[PDB]
């Protein structure tokens, strides 16, 4: 249930960040999954940051699921990630989506969820931020 994970992000303006956190996921319904996570992030530009996010996956079809992520950070920055996850293979799925903020300017992104071995799942996120930069993140969790 509770998986420790580490995030590693790089942006086209050479701003990097490393995060450490845990995620506990529950199954509220047979086609509905919820998740809560908290992490500590160290950044190139803003030093330290703490973020708390809630996730949810709702089955839309046999291999499609609606994913939502709500995140708020200690620097008073928040966002909303809404994506549709398509399961391609038993250990492979893609989830193109968009990030929302009160500052508007919806930011498109894509997640690639794959399992590197039995006890490791990796989530690769490629997002296009509102500052015209591109951020590539690598999330590794211990299954």
Residue numbers in the entry: 5 to 147
Task: Copy the relevant paper text.
pmcTransmembrane β-barrel (TMB) nanopores formed by a circularly closed single β-sheet provide rigid scaffolds for the transport of molecules across cellular and organelle membranes. Encouraged by the success in designing these narrow TMBs, we reasoned that de novo protein design should provide a general approach to creating robust β-barrel nanopore scaffolds for a next generation of nanopore sensors. We set out to develop general methods to overcome these challenges and design stable monomeric channels with tunable pore shapes, sizes, and single-channel conductance.
To modulate the size of the pore, we increased the number of β-strands (10, 12, and 14 strands) while keeping the transmembrane span and the connectivity between β-strands (the shear number) constant. The first-generation backbones corresponding to these designs were assembled with the Rosetta BlueprintBDR application and had similar cylindrical shapes. Such cylindrical β-sheet configurations are strained as a result of repulsion between side chains packing the barrel lumen. Glycine kinks (glycine residues in extended positive-φ conformation) were introduced into the blueprint to relieve the strain and to bend the β-strands to form corners in the β-barrel cross section. On the lipid-exposed surface, design calculations favored Ser and Thr in close proximity to a glycine kink where they could form a hydrogen bond to the β-strand backbone, effectively mimicking the backbone-water hydrogen bonds observed in strongly bent β-strands of water-soluble β-barrels. As previously observed for eight-stranded TMBs, a delicate balance between the optimization of tertiary structure energy and negative design (introduction of locally frustrated residues) to disfavor premature β-strand formation before membrane insertion was critical for the expression of the larger TMB nanopores in E. coli inclusion bodies. Despite the inversion of the hydrophobic exterior and polar core compared with globular proteins and the almost entirely local nature of the side chain interactions, our approach enables TMB design with atomic level precision, as highlighted by the close agreement between the experimentally determined crystal and NMR structures and the corresponding design models.
